[PDB]
Design a binder for these strands. Structure first.
Ligand code: ZN
Ligand code: ZN
Length: 54
DNA sequence: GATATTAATATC
DNA sequence: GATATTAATATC
């Protein structure tokens, strides 16, 4: 029953609405300790993290 | 919240 | 065109 303010998207988790707000604003709180790439979700940062590790 | 999934994008 | 990466989001 969560909704969004900048656009009209309903969300499931409240954390989901928070990350999607980050999708509007540009807050990418997860910093790659190797390269400087920053990410919205921790999972996306782990995704990228796999890249240099191999 | 973590993870998996799809669509979109950068790299070649 | 193929492939790797990313961005956003459904699913658990
Ligand atoms: Zn929104
Ligand atoms: Zn990195």
């Amino acid at each position: 029953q969560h909704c969004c303010t900048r656009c009209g998207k309903n969300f499931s988790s409240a954390s989901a609405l928070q990350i999607h707000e980050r999708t509007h604003t540009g807050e990418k709180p997860f910093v790659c300790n190797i390269c400087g790439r920053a990410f919205t979700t921790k999972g996306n940062l782990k995704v990228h993290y796999m890249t240099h590790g191999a």
